[PDB]
């Protein structure tokens, strides 16, 4: 699934 706004660069 696509990341939530702001969380797209979280490592896992």
């Amino acid at each position, epitope marked *: 699934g696509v990341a939530m*706004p702001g*969380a797209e660069d979280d490592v896992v």
Partner: antibody
Amino acid sequence: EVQLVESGGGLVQPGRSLKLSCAASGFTFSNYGMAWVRQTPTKGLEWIASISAGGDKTYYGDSVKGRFSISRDNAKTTHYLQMDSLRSEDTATYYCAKTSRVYFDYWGQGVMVTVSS
Amino acid sequence: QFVLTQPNSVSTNLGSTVKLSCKRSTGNIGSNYVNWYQQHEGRSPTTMIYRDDKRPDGVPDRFSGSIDRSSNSALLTINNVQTEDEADYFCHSYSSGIVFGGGTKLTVLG
């Protein structure tokens, strides 16, 4: 052991500013985004803002029309919410919350902000 | 960009199964993950379910999540409900913005 420790709340007059801090530790601070979420009994949980793992991308929610801005200091491993032009309706418990791509994996302890003359 | 509607409250009985719903107003519930948070009186939220149906280790296996597409709703099911499960439960999803349901207060008699 993930720890998110908030400070800086209390009572503030309308039209004045306040800056909340969220001191993080117990995980690699720079590998994860962070968000601020507020709570009231009548409006529930409202997302205010998020900032990305590298501190370079920010996202604001429509519940506050840009009066609050989010920042971080990765060397102090601390996140901040700068709350300007405060209004009575901003009274709430403010949480910071760590993200893990698709959900909020840990929440701070919350701090109360009361906007009142 | 959408709202998530939760009942205000459910009252159930020790040992029962209870289902807490979270209905998405527009767009498919299945189009992004739904998560569930438990919040006790006076305390911070903690994760019950994330990524629709995954359970953090440490959360009792009587909690489970599912997605019901026919009612466009996510469901938190608690089997063998216990009085320590009294809490407010919030669902969470997202698309272009981040959305919380309004929270359901669970009361356990018996």
